[PDB]
C-alpha cells in the first residue's frame, strides 16, 4: 500500500584501470537459470590493440563464496567489436554470445568489408577462446539483439548499421533479420531478410513475446534513431510499423535529431506503461512518451505523446552530449519500472553528466517522474540483473564510456552496485550497520555477521507481510523493529522489540516459517551453526567467535576480528571486575540508513562463568532501554536480578541479594524491560536525561566453577520508547475501521475531521448525524506494537487524533501526521463500560488527572479532552468502511 | 599530555588494474619543497613487457584543485627495474631519479651483465622520457639509496646486490658507494668504492646526518639481510660497523635467516628510540630491537636486544611468507614514530597477512607495542608523506605486491590513505561528517562544505592549544565542541557550544588569530566568500548554495546539490506554511568517528523574507537543544521570540505577540539556549523524553516585502547537555591545583582519595593532618565549559570527586572515572563565605534540599554530602602542587 523506498547500493569495483570501455552485459551462463549471472565487458580497441571480449566470472555464483574477485576469461579477441547479445543457438541449455565486429574506429572510419556478425559457441564450461562462426556482414553494423521475430523454433537476430560508409550521416541502413540454420554447427551463411530502412539507428530494444501477456506471438523491435522511436513487429504473415514519436526536432547545421536510445517500461499489468528515450544521438535530452490513461496495454494500440523531462546542457563542436543509453528496470520492486540514464561524462568534467540517474514514476495518473543519482562514475552502458542473491532485487552494472574520437572517461572501469537493505562500515573495533526502513522496502535482506556460541547471528530486514523459512524448533529470533508472527498448535505467537516488563519470552520459532507484520520487521536471526562450538561452554577458547560478513561487504570489515576480552581489561573497567570470569565482545551499531541516521539499537555480547556477578549498576552513565537475550545458560540458573528496595537502600558493592528478585533467562530466551516506567509505559527519566533503572545485574547460577560452564548473552540497547502498561489492562477492543459515535438511542453524533482536511492542526469535532447529513467518518483504530495503547487515525487522510499541546483539562483536539515523540498526545488507553461503550484515555501526565476523548456539550460540537464527566466521554463503535 | 589517537584515513585509488606491482615512492619534484609530492610506482615487468616507470602527478598540488585523478607520466621504460631513490645531482633544485634495472626475473634468473644503476635527469617540467646516464653495474643489484656517505659537496649512492648470480644464496655481495662526478652531465662512469660484503641484503635504510642532532657528519647505512641488521657509517677517515642484532636464527634446509627489512624509529629527542625489523627474507616475523633506558641517543653507542613481536604464520615450499618491508613514520603526530608492516598477501588468501599493520609504542619504559589494521589490500612497499595538506599529518601510499614467481596479488594497484580528522559520506540528501575527538588529535583539519550567503562554511577540528589564523573582523566562528579563545584590546573572548540562556554572542573574530583550549575544539568557520553573493539578499536565486567539498572526499558526496526548498514543499509540511517566503536547506550530521558513533550536532539552514514567521513550535516531536546563528538579518530586526506565559496560555496558531519577548539576532551572531532548564543548568525534560521548550519561533522583521530582504540562519541541533545557571552565580574561584582543608586555626584535616587508589568507587575521606603525617593530597579544581559548575579531580589519579548513587542526605563520596551523564553527581556550584571558605554544592535534585560536600564529624573522618549544617561544609583552599 505504502510508497516504496529505494534500496541501498554497495559498490564493488569489478575491473579497474581498463585501456578503453564501451559495452557491458549481464550474461547468464545457462539459458535455464538467471541466478548470479556473469558480466561481459569491452571496448572497441584500436588499430594496435585488438579488443579482449572479457567474460568476468561472478564470485557469488560459487556457494559459500569467500572471493570478491571477478576472474576475467577472454572469450575472444576481435577487430573493433561494437554491440552484442546472447541466446541458446545450439539449443543445449548454454548461452551463446552473438557479437558484431570489424566495425572500424568511428562513423568517419567505417570498414567497407566489415560490420561482421558472428556467434561464439558456449562449450558448457569456463574455457577461454570459443569457436567463432560468421552469420553475415553489413558495413557499419552497430547494434543487434537476439530473439524470435518471425518464428519460435529457431534463434533469430536483428542487426542494424548506424551508417553505411565513412562520414555518411544521410544514407539510411537496412534493418536485418538473421535466422539460425537447423545445424548452426556447420560453417555456412545464415539466412537473411531485410525488414526495413532507417536513418542513424543508435539503439535496438526488444520486447519478448512472453512479456506481453498473450498480446504478441513474437518479439517487438523498438528502434531509436533519426526517424525517432518506432516499433516494428511481425504478426505471422506481415511486418508492420507503429510510430511512437519523432524525437528531437532537427536544427540546421546539426546532423543529429530524433532519438539515440529508448526503452519500454512496465507499469503494473501493462508491460508498456511508458517509453523513455534519450535524444538525439549522444544527446543531452531525456524525454518520456505517454499514452492516455485507460489506453489498451502494449505499444501498437495507443497513440504516444512526447514529454521532454530534462536537458542536461548544451552540445559541443561534434554536436554531441553526454547521454548514451536508457534502460528500464524495477529498482525498488514495487511492480513498475524505473529507468536509468547512462551518463558518459563530459568535457570539461561535470558530475551532473556522469554516472547513472534513476527516474521514478511517482504519479501514475499525471505521468510525473522524479530523479535520484545512483552513481557518479562514467556509465557508457548499463546492465541489470541480480548479481548476488536469489530474490528479485536488481543490481546495476556499468562500464566507463571511453572511445577514441568521442569521449574518453579517465580511469575507465567496470563497477556493479549491489542492491541491499543493509550496508556495513568499519568504525574502529565496532561495525556500523545501516538499515533501510522495513515499512517501505519491498525486499528481504539477510546478512550474517558473527558466528558465536553455536549460532550464526544474522541481521535480517523483512518487508511488510514477508515470509521467512526457518528450521522449526531450532531457529531463534529477536525483533529490533516491527513485529513477526508464527503459528503452531497453540495459535499466533508475536515478537516485538520488548516483551512485558519483567517477563521472559522464548526466541525459538516453533513453526516451519514466520511472517512480518504490517510494518515489516528488522531482527537478529540465530541460525544453528556447527562452526562455533556446542554447549556447555567450559572455557572461553571454546567460544572464540568468527567474522561472518559476506564477500561483497568491504574488505576492512571482512578483516575485522571480534575477540572476547576480560571485563577487567576493557578501558572502562577502572580497576573493577578483577578476578572475574566475566568477558565482553563488541560490537555492532544498527542504525537507520536514511538522512536521520537515527539509532535502531547498539548490540554487544557477554559471558559469565559459574558464581560470577556482572556487577549491580543503574545506567546513570548513558541513556538507553536494554533487553538481553541469553544464548547459553551455563547452569540453567543464570539470569537478571533487580533490587526491589529504593536505591538509597541498596549497596551495589556488597549486595543484599534478598532485596532482589531473580528472573532466570533460559537458553534462547529474552527478558522484558527492567527500567522504571510510568503506568501507560513511558520510561521514568532521571534529572540528567537517562532512563531510570533500579539497581540490577546479570548473575550466573551459583556453585563451584568446576567443571566450568559459561552464560553467554546478547545486549540490545534501544533508545527510549513506550513499553507495556502497569497493570496490564483487559483487551476490550479489536483493531478495525469504525465510525465513532456519541449520544443515545435518541440523537447521536460522530467523530470527524473538519472538512476531511489533511493539514496538521485541523480540528477534530462531533458532527450531528443530521437528516440528509453526510455519512459518518471512518477511523482506523489500531494497536501500538509493544504497548497496551491504541491509535486512532483518519481513514481517508491518515491523520492521527491528537490532543493539542499541552494535554490539560478542556484542551482542543486535532489531526496530525506530526505526533509528539512516543505518541504522547496521540495514543490511548481503552476501557469498555458495561453498556459496551468505549473510553479513550491519554497517558496520565505527572500531576494532572486522567483526561478522556470527549464532546463538550449536549453545527458541530467541539472535541476536547477532559476527565470530570464520564457521560461526555462514552463512545459507540460501529464497524465502518 | 593526553595519549594521542590515530587519525582517520580516506582511501583513494591512485591507479588500478595494474599489470604487475612492486615499488612505490613519495617523489618531491623539487628538493627545496616536500609539499604535496608526486608518486612513483612500478613492477619488474616481464620478458615481453618492459616496465613503465610511472611518475603519477599529485592532483592536490595544483591550487584550488578539482581533480581526483593521478595523471601518469612515463619517466622511463626499462628491463626489470627493481629499487629506486632520488636526490638533486645536477644541484639545481630538481629531484633526479636513481634506479636499478637490468636485474633479471628472479634470484634464479640473474642477468650476469645486468644490475645496472642509472640516474634520470629532471628537466624541471613534467615531460615524459628523461635522459638516462649509467652510474655502474653489479649483477643482482637489488636495493639502493642516495645521500652523503663520505662527503657533503656531492651526491653519493649506496647500492647492494641481494645475490651475485642465478640460484646462489650463499655468496655474499658488495656494499657499493657510487660518487657523482663534478659534471654528472657528461656520460662517463661514476667513481666506486666497495665498503663491505654481506649475505642476502634485502633492504637498505639511511639516516640523514641532519637527523642525528649533531651526532654524525654523514648518513648511516642500515642493512637487513642474512647477517641480521647492522649499521655501517663513516667518521671522516674510516668505515666502522655496529651490529644491531642477528635476526632470525637459521633452521636447516631453509636458506633464509636474519632480516628481510628494518627501519629506525624516533622516540622523542632520540632519532633511534628503537629499530623494528621483519624476518627473514619475505618472512612472517616482526621483531623490535631495544636499548636499555638511559642509553645515549643514536645507534652505535647502545647494545641492542631483539624482541619477537608476532609471527603471522608458517612459510611455504619456497621458504617464504608475507612481510616485505617495514618503515617508520609519525602517524599520529605525537613525536614518536609508529611503524608500518607491508603485508604482501598470502596463498591461500588471508586478511591477517594482507595490507598494512600499524604498530604503536604505548609504553616507552617497557617498550610494549600494540597494532591496528590501517588497510587490508596488498602492500608490497609503503611510502609516507603528506600528500594533501600543509601540516605534518602523514598519509600512507601502497602498491600491491605482484611479482611473477613469488606472489601475485590479484587486481594489483596503487592506493593512498589520506590522514584526516574529518570523513564524509553521503546518506541520501544529507552528508554524514565523522569527526575525531579534538582532545586526542595532534592535527588541525579543515574541510570546506557549503558556499552560501557570502560565506564558505568550513568544518574545522583543532587539537588542544592549536592556533588558527583568520581574517580579523571578518572571520566568524561557531563552537560545537570544546572552546576557542582570542584577544583584543578588551581581553580574552571565549566561545563555547552555547552562550548564556537568552543571550546573544557575536561570532566575529576581532583578532588576527584564535586558539583552542585544553580540550581542543570542533567548530564551523565562516570564511568570507565572493562566490556566493552579497547581502542584502533580495531573492532566493541570490542565495543559491554551492558544494564546497574537496577533491579527496568521495565522488558521490562531491556530486551532491543542496537546493533551497520552500518549507511548504518539504514532506514534513503537511499543508502548513503555504504562501510563506520561508525556505530550508539540508543538511549535515556531524557525528563522532569513534566506536560510539555518538552525535555531535545536526546542522541545517533557513531563510525568511520580510514579515514571515517560521511558526511557533515547541519540539515535542524530537528531542534536542538548539542554537541558531544568523548569517544575514534581512532587516536588522529579525530574531527569536519565545512565549513568557505558560504553554496552555498561548495559541501557536494565532499568536499573541505581546506574550512573547524578542531577541534580535544581528548579522553573524548566535543566541543562547531558549529551552527550560533546572537552576544549575540541566534541561527540563518532558514526559516523552524531549527537551522542554516554551513556544518559540524565528520571526523576520515586519514591514512590506518590497524591496525584499532575507534573514538567513543556521541551526545547530545538539543532544542534551548542562548549560549555564539561573541566576548566574558570582565568580569566587580560580581553576587550579589545591589542598582542600577542613578545621580551624587549631586542628585541620584535608580531602583525600583513600590510598590514592584509582579504582572506580574508592572512598573520599578527610585525613587528619597528623604530626609526622602524609602531606595534603592535591586536587585539580576546574571550571566546566559552558556552565557555571566546577569539577574536582584527583591530581594523581584523575578520579572525579563524586557522590554515590543516589545523592541524598548522608550519602558517601568517592572517586570515579565513570561519572553520571551531564556530570550529575560530580559537578559543583561554588559559594565563598565572608571568611573566604568555599562550599561545593550538588545540582539540586527535584524534591530534596541542597546537599554540600561535607565532613561528618568533629583515623579518617568520612566524607558525605549533607545540607543541614553550614559548619561541616566549609573548606579552605590552599594552593598545592
Ligand atoms: O557510441 C558509439 C561509439 O562510437 C561508434 C562509432 O561511430 C558509434 C557509437 O554509437
Ligand atoms: O548491560 C550490561 C551493562 O554492563 C554490565 C557490566 O557491569 C553488564 C551488562 O549485561
Ligand atoms: O621482492 C623481491 C622481488 O623479487 C626479487 C627477485 O629475486 C627479489 C625481491 O626481494
Ligand atoms: O529550528 C527550527 C525548527 O523548525 C522551525 C520551522 O517551524 C524553524 C526553525 O528554525
Ligand atoms: Mg546454446
Ligand atoms: Mg638535480
Ligand atoms: Zn554511441
Ligand atoms: Zn519500481
Ligand atoms: Zn543493565
Ligand atoms: Zn623482496
Ligand atoms: Zn606517533
Ligand atoms: Zn525551535
CA distance A48 to A404: 13
Residue B247, all three cell numbers: 635476526
**Are A122 and A29 spatial neighbours (Cβ–Cβ below 8 Å)?**
yes
Beta strand B431-435 pairing with B582-592: parallel
Kindly identify which residue of chain A lies nearest to residue B678, measuring between CA atoms.
A687
A542 to chain B, any CB pair closer than 8 A? The answer is no
What is the set of active-site residues of B? Answer: 142
Give, as one character, the DSSP assignment of residue A691: B
Atom of ligand 1 at shortest range from CA of A260: 10
CA distance A401 to A324: 9
Residue A173, CA distances (Å) to A204, A230, A250 in order = 13, 15, 19
**Are B416 and B378 spatial neighbours (Cβ–Cβ below 8 Å)?**
no
Closest CA to B139 of B160, B111, B118: B111
Using DSSP's 3-state secondary structure scheme, residue A438 falls into helix
Residue B498, CA distances (Å) to A224, B465, B507 in order = 61, 20, 12
Using DSSP's 3-state secondary structure scheme, residue A375 falls into strand
Residue B527, all three cell numbers: 570564511
Count how many residues are written for chain B: 881
CA distance A407 to A345: 8
Residues 369-388 of A with CB under 8 A from B: 373, 375-377
Interface test with B, best of A423, A805, A809, A826 (most B CBs within 10 A): A805
A49 to chain B, any CB pair closer than 8 A? The answer is no
Which residue puts its alpha carbon closest to atom 1 of ligand 4?
B715
**Are B14 and B413 spatial neighbours (Cβ–Cβ below 8 Å)?**
yes
**Are B576 and A760 spatial neighbours (Cβ–Cβ below 8 Å)?**
yes
* CA dihedral sign, ordered A338, A344, A346, A349: positive
Beta strand B736-743 pairing with B669-671: unpaired
**Are B599 and B623 spatial neighbours (Cβ–Cβ below 8 Å)?**
no
CA distance A279 to A257: 7
Beta strand A381-385 pairing with A395-399: antiparallel
Q: For A319-421, where are the E strands, in sequence order? A: 323-329, 338-344, 354-363, 368-375, 381-385, 395-399, 402-403, 407-408, 414-420
Residue B99, all three cell numbers: 634506479
CA distance B571 to B586: 13
CA distance A393 to B689: 39
Q: In chain B, which residues have their Cβ closer than 8 Å to the Cβ of A585?
A: none
* C-alpha distance from A585 to closest chain B C-alpha (Å): 13
**Are A548 and A449 spatial neighbours (Cβ–Cβ below 8 Å)?**
yes
Residue A783, all three cell numbers: 494497536
Q: How was this structure determined?
A: X-ray
* CA dihedral sign, ordered B50, B53, B56, B57: negative
Closest CA to A179 of A232, A218, A125: A218
CA distance B534 to B543: 9
Q: Which residue from B575, B689, B761 is facing A759, i.e. has the nearest CB? A: B575
Tell me which residue has cell 472538512: A755
Q: Ligand 11: distance of its center to the CA of B306 in Å?
A: 21
Residue B499, all three cell numbers: 552562550
Under an 8 A CB cutoff, do A687 and B682 touch?
A: yes
* C-alpha distance from B320 to closest chain A C-alpha (Å): 22
- The rounded Cα A628 to chain-centroid distance in angstroms is 28
Closest CA to A206 of A248, A133, A273, A143: A143
How do the domains of chain B map onto residue ranges?
1-421, 422-722, 723-881
* C-alpha distance from A790 to closest chain B C-alpha (Å): 17
CA distance B803 to B840: 12
The maximal CA–CA distance of chain B, rounded, in angstroms, is 98
Ligand nearest to the CA of B278: 10
Beta strand B381-385 pairing with B368-375: unpaired
Residue A334, all three cell numbers: 514495487
Closest CA to B763 of B784, B794, B808, B738: B794
Residue B22, all three cell numbers: 612492486
Closest CA to A852 of A828, A835, A833: A828
Tell me which residue has cell 560452564: A709
Residues 6+ apart with CB under 8 A from A112: A139, A165
CA distance A235 to A209: 11
Tell me which residue has cell 569491452: A42
Beta strand A338-344 pairing with A323-329: antiparallel
Give, as one character, the DSSP assignment of residue B250: P
Burial pattern B525-544, b for ≥16 Cβ within 10 A else e, equals bbbebeebbebebbebeebe
Rounded to 5 degrees, φ, ψ at A460 are -130, 130
Domain at A723-881: CATH architecture: Trefoil (2.80)
Tell me which residue has cell 539556549: B673
Q: Using alpha carbons only, how large is chain B's radius of gyration in Å?
A: 33
Give, as one character, the DSSP assignment of residue A555: H
- Using alpha carbons only, what angle is made at residue A509 by residues A505 and A515, rounded to the nearest 5 degrees? 105
Question: Domain B422-722: which topology?
Answer: Jelly Rolls (2.60.120)
- Using alpha carbons only, what angle is made at residue A326 by residues A323 and A329, rounded to the nearest 5 degrees? 145
B422-722 against B723-881: fold identical: no
CA distance B599 to B621: 18
Q: Which of the following is catalytic: A85, A142, A199, A671?
A: A142
Euclidean distance between the first and the last CA atom of chain B, given in angstroms as a whole number: 17
- For A639-681, give the secondary structure using H, E and C: EEEEECCCHHHCCCCCCCHHHEEEEECCCCEEECCCCCECCCC
Using DSSP's 3-state secondary structure scheme, residue B252 falls into coil
Q: Ligand 7: distance of its center to the CA of A202 in Å?
A: 6
Using DSSP's 3-state secondary structure scheme, residue A568 falls into helix
* CA dihedral sign, ordered B387, B393, B395, B396: positive
Ligand nearest to the CA of B652: 4
CA distance A680 to A729: 10
B249 to chain A, any CB pair closer than 8 A? The answer is no
Tell me which residue has cell 465502518: A880
Taking 3-state DSSP, the helix, strand and coil percentages for chain B, each rounded to the nearest 5, stand at 5, 45, 50
CA distance B105 to B45: 8
Interface test with A, best of B595, B647, B682, B851 (most A CBs within 10 A): B595
Tell me the HSE value of A266 on the side-chain side, using a 13 A CA sphere: 16
The maximal CA–CA distance of chain A, rounded, in angstroms, is 98
Count how many residues are written for chain A: 881
**Are B435 and B593 spatial neighbours (Cβ–Cβ below 8 Å)?**
yes
Contacts 24+ apart (CB under 8 A), B118-121: B119/B89, B119/B184, B120/B53, B120/B75, B120/B76, B120/B96, B121/B89, B121/B90, B121/B96, B121/B185
* C-alpha distance from B376 to closest chain A C-alpha (Å): 6
| Residues paired with residue B286 on neighbouring β-strands, in sequence order | B278, B310
Which residue puts its alpha carbon closest to atom 4 of ligand 3?
B106
CA distance A366 to B212: 77
Closest CA to B691 of B676, B679, B680: B676
Beta strand A368-375 pairing with A381-385: unpaired
A845 to chain B, any CB pair closer than 8 A? The answer is yes
CA distance B830 to B662: 32
Residue A295, all three cell numbers: 489506453
Residue A271, CA distances (Å) to A215, A297, A300 in order = 10, 7, 12
- The rounded Cα B649 to chain-centroid distance in angstroms is 51
B69 to chain A, any CB pair closer than 8 A? The answer is yes
Tell me which residue has cell 578476578: A579
**Are B256 and B319 spatial neighbours (Cβ–Cβ below 8 Å)?**
yes
Q: In chain B, which residues have their Cβ closer than 8 Å to the Cβ of A17?
A: 15-18, 413
CA distance A157 to A135: 9
CA distance B730 to B713: 33
Rounded to 5 degrees, φ, ψ at B503 are -80, 180
Under an 8 A CB cutoff, do A821 and B587 touch?
A: no
CA distance A553 to A447: 10
Burial pattern B222-233, b for ≥16 Cβ within 10 A else e, equals bbbbbbbbbbbb
- The rounded Cα A51 to chain-centroid distance in angstroms is 37
Tell me which residue has cell 548476488: A388
- The rounded Cα A860 to chain-centroid distance in angstroms is 46
Ligand nearest to the CA of A30: 5
Query: Number of H helices and number of E strands within chain A?
Result: 1, 63
Residue A85, CA distances (Å) to A41, A120, B548 in order = 12, 11, 43
Residues 132-191 of B with CB under 8 A from A: none
Q: Ligand 12: distance of its center to the CA of B698 in Å?
A: 8
Residues 394-413 of A with CB under 8 A from B: 410-411, 413
- For A753-820, give the secondary structure using H, E and C: EHHHCCCCCEEEEEEECCCCCCCCCEEEEEECCCCCCEEEEECCCCCEEEECCCCCCCEEEEEECCCC
Closest CA to B743 of B562, B633, B876: B876
A702 to chain B, any CB pair closer than 8 A? The answer is no
Tell me which residue has cell 501557536: B652
Edge-to-edge strand list for the sheet holding B660-664: B660-664, B639-643, B696-699
CA distance A742 to A708: 66
Closest CA to B100 of B88, B110, B90: B110
Ligand nearest to the CA of A89: 5
Kindly identify which residue of chain B lies nearest to residue A806, measuring between CA atoms.
B648
| Residues paired with residue A232 on neighbouring β-strands, in sequence order | A221, A241
Q: In chain A, which residues have their Cβ closer than 8 Å to the Cβ of B808?
A: 648
Tell me which residue has cell 512573547: B660
- The rounded Cα B546 to chain-centroid distance in angstroms is 27
Residues 6+ apart with CB under 8 A from B423: B8, B10, B433, B434, B593
Residue B206, all three cell numbers: 639511511
Under an 8 A CB cutoff, do A821 and B620 touch?
A: yes
Tell me the HSE value of A174 on the side-chain side, using a 13 A CA sphere: 16
**Are A178 and A136 spatial neighbours (Cβ–Cβ below 8 Å)?**
yes
Under an 8 A CB cutoff, do A575 and B821 touch?
A: no
Give, as one character, the DSSP assignment of residue A18: -
Residue B610, CA distances (Å) to B563, B582, B604, B656 in order = 21, 10, 21, 19
Closest CA to A43 of A406, A417, A416: A406
Can you say which residues of B are annotated as belonging to the binding site for Zn(2+)? 202, 282, 324, 330, 332, 334, 336, 338, 617, 619, 626, 696
CA distance A259 to A307: 13
Give, as one character, the DSSP assignment of residue B248: B
- For B733-781, give the secondary structure using H, E and C: CCCEEEEEEEECCCCEEEEEEHHHCCCCCEEEEEEECCCCCCCCCEEEE
Can you say which residues of A are annotated as belonging to the binding site for Zn(2+)? 202, 282, 324, 330, 332, 334, 336, 338, 617, 619, 626, 696
Rounded to 5 degrees, φ, ψ at A294 are 75, 15
Torsion of CA B234, B238, B244, B246, to 10 degrees: 130
Is B107 near ligand 3, meaning CB less than 6 Å away? yes
**Are B204 and B145 spatial neighbours (Cβ–Cβ below 8 Å)?**
yes
B833 to chain A, any CB pair closer than 8 A? The answer is no
| Residues paired with residue A225 on neighbouring β-strands, in sequence order | A228
Q: How many beta carbons lie within 10 A of that of residue B702, not counting itself? A: 12
- The rounded Cα B41 to chain-centroid distance in angstroms is 27
Is A502 near ligand 1, meaning CB less than 6 Å away? no
Amino acid at each position: 500500500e505504502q510508497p516504496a523506498a529505494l534500496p541501498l547500493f554497495q559498490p564493488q569495483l569489478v575491473q579497474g584501470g581498463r585501456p578503453d570501455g564501451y559495452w557491458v552485459e549481464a550474461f547468464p551462463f545457462r539459458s535455464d537459470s538467471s541466478k548470479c549471472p556473469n558480466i561481459i565487458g569491452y571496448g572497441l580497441g584500436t588499430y594496435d590493440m585488438k579488443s579482449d571480449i572479457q567474460m568476468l566470472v561472478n564470485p557469488y555464483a560459487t556457494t559459500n563464496n569467500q572471493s570478491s574477485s571477478w576472474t576475467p576469461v577472454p572469450l575472444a579477441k576481435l577487430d573493433f567489436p561494437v554491440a552484442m547479445h546472447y541466446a541458446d543457438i545450439t539449443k543445449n541449455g548454454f548461452n551463446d554470445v552473438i557479437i558484431t565486429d570489424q566495425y572500424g574506429s568511428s562513423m568517419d572510419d567505417i570498414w567497407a568489408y566489415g560490420g561482421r556478425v558472428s556467434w561464439l559457441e558456449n562449450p558448457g564450461e569456463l574455457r577461454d577462446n570459443w569457436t567463432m562462426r560468421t552469420i553475415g556482414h553489413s558495413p557499419g553494423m552497430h547494434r543487434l539483439k537476439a530473439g524470435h521475430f518471425t518464428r519460435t523454433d529457431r534463434v533469430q537476430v536483428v542487426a542494424v548499421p548506424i551508417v553505411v560508409a565513412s562520414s555518411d550521416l544521410t544514407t539510411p541502413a537496412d534493418v536485418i533479420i538473421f535466422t539460425a540454420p537447423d545445424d548452426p554447427r556447420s560453417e555456412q551463411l545464415w539466412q537473411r531478410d531485410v525488414v526495413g530502412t532507417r536513418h542513424l539507428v543508435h539503439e535496438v530494444a526488444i520486447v519478448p513475446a512472453a512479456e506481453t501477456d498473450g498480446e504478441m506471438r513474437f518479439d517487438q523491435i523498438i528502434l531509436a534513431g533519426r526517424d525517432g522511436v518506432d516499433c516494428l513487429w511481425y504478426d505471422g504473415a506481415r511486418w508492420q510499423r507503429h510510430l511512437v514519436g519523432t524525437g528531437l526536432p532537427e536544427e540546421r547545421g546539426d546532423p543529429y535529431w530524433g532519438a539515440g536510445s529508448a526503452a519500454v517500461g512496465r507499469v503494473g499489468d501493462d508491460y508498456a506503461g511508458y517509453i523513455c528515450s534519450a535524444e538525439a544521438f549522444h544527446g543531452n535530452t531525456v524525454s518520456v512518451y505517454t499514452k492516455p490513461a485507460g489506453s489498451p496495454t502494449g505499444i501498437v494500440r495507443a497513440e504516444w505523446t512526447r514529454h521532454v523531462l530534462d536537458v542536461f546542457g548544451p552540445l559541443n563542436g561534434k554536436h554531441t552530449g553526454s547521454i548514451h543509453q536508457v534502460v528500464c528496470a524495477d529498482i525498488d520492486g514495487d511492480g513498475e519500472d524505473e529507468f536509468l540514464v547512462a551518463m558518459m561524462g563530459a568535457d570539461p568534467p561535470d558530475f551532473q553528466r556522469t554516472g547513472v540517474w534513476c527516474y521514478k514514476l511517482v504519479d501514475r495518473t499525471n505521468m510525473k517522474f522524479s530523479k535520484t543519482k545512483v552513481s557518479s562514475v562514467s556509465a557508457g552502458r548499463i546492465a541489470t540483473a541480480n548479481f548476488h542473491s536469489q530474490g528479485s532485487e536488481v543490481d546495476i552494472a556499468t562500464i566507463s564510456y571511453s572511445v577514441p574520437g568521442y569521449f574518453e572517461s579517465p580511469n575507465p572501469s567496470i563497477n556493479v552496485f549491489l542492491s541491499t537493505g543493509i550496508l556495513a562500515e568499519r568504525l574502529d573495533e565496532e561495525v556500523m550497520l545501516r538499515v533501510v526502513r522495513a515499512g517501505s522496502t519491498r525486499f528481504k535482506t539477510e546478512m550474517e555477521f558473527l558466528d558465536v556460541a553455536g549460532k550464526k547471528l544474522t541481521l535480517v530486514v523483512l518487508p511488510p507481510f514477508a515470509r521467512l523459512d526457518v528450521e522449526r524448533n531450532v531457529s531463534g529470533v529477536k525483533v529490533m523493529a516491527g513485529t513477526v508472527c508464527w503459528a503452531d498448535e497453540n495459535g499466533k505467537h508475536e515478537r516485538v522489540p520488548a516483551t512485558r516488563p519483567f517477563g521472559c519470552e522464548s526466541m525459538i520459532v516453533s513453526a516451519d516459517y514466520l511472517e512480518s507484520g504490517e510494518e515489516g520487521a528488522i531482527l537478529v536471526l540465530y541460525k544453528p551453526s556447527s562452526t562455533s562450538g556446542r554447549p556447555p561452554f567450559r572455557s572461553m577458547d571454546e567460544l572464540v567467535a568468527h567474522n561472518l560478513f559476506p564477500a561483497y561487504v568491504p574488505d576492512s570489515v571482512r578483516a575485522m576480528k571480534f575477540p572476547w576480552v576480560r571485563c577487567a581489561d576493557r578501558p572502562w573497567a577502572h580497576g573493577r571486575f578483577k578476578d572475574l570470569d566475566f568477558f565482553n565482545l563488541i560490537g555492532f551499531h544498527v542504525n537507520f540508513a536514511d538522512d536521520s541516521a537515527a539509532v535502531l539499537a547498539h548490540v554487544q555480547l557477554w559471558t559469565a562463568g559459574i558464581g560470577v556477578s556482572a556487577g549491580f549498576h543503574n545506567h546513570v552513565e548513558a541513556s538507553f532501554c536494554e533487553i538481553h537475550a541469553c544464548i547459553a545458560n551455563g547452569t540453567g540458573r543464570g539470569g537478571m536480578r533487580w533490587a526491589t528496595v529504593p536505591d538509597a537502600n541498596f549497596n551495589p558493592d556488597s549486595p543484599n541479594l534478598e532485596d532482589t528478585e531473580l528472573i532466570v533467562v533460559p537458553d534462547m530466551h529474552e527478558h522484558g524491560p527492567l527500567w522504571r516506567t510510568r503506568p501507560d509505559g513511558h520510561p521514568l527519566l532521571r534529572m540528567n536525561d537517562t532512563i531510570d533503572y533500579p539497581w540490577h545485574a546479570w548473575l550466573a547460577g551459583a556453585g563451584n566453577p568446576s567443571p566450568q560452564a559459561f552464560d553467554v548473552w546478547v545486549a540490545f540497547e534501544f533508545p527510549g520508547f513506550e513499553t507495556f502498561s502497569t497493570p496490564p489492562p483487559p483487551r476490550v477492543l479489536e483493531p478495525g475501521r469504525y465510525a465513532i459515535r456519541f449520544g443515545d438511542p435518541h440523537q447521536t453524533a460522530s467523530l470527524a475531521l473538519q472538512k476531511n482536511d489533511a493539514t496538521d492542526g485541523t480540528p477534530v469535532l462531533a458532527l450531528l448525524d443530521l437528516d440528509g447529513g453526510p455519512s459518518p467518518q471512518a477511523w482506523n483504530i489500531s494497536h501500538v506494537p509493544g504497548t497496551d495503547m491504541y491509535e486512532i487515525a483518519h481513514a481517508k487522510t491518515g491523520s492521527l487524533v491528537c490532543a493539542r499541546w499541552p494535554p490539560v483539562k478542556n484542551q482542543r483536539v486535532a489531526g496530525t501526521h506530526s505526533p509528539a515523540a512516543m505518541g504522547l498526545t496521540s495514543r490511548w488507553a481503552v476501557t469498555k463500560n458495561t453498556k459496551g461503550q468505549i473510553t479513550f484515555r491519554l497517558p496520565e501526565a505527572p500531576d494532572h488527572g486522567p483526561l478522556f476523548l470527549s464532546v463538550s456539550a449536549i453545527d458541530a460540537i467541539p472535541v476536547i479532552v477532559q476527565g470530570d464527566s464520564i457521560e461526555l466521554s462514552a463512545w459507540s463503535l460501529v464497524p465502518a468502511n
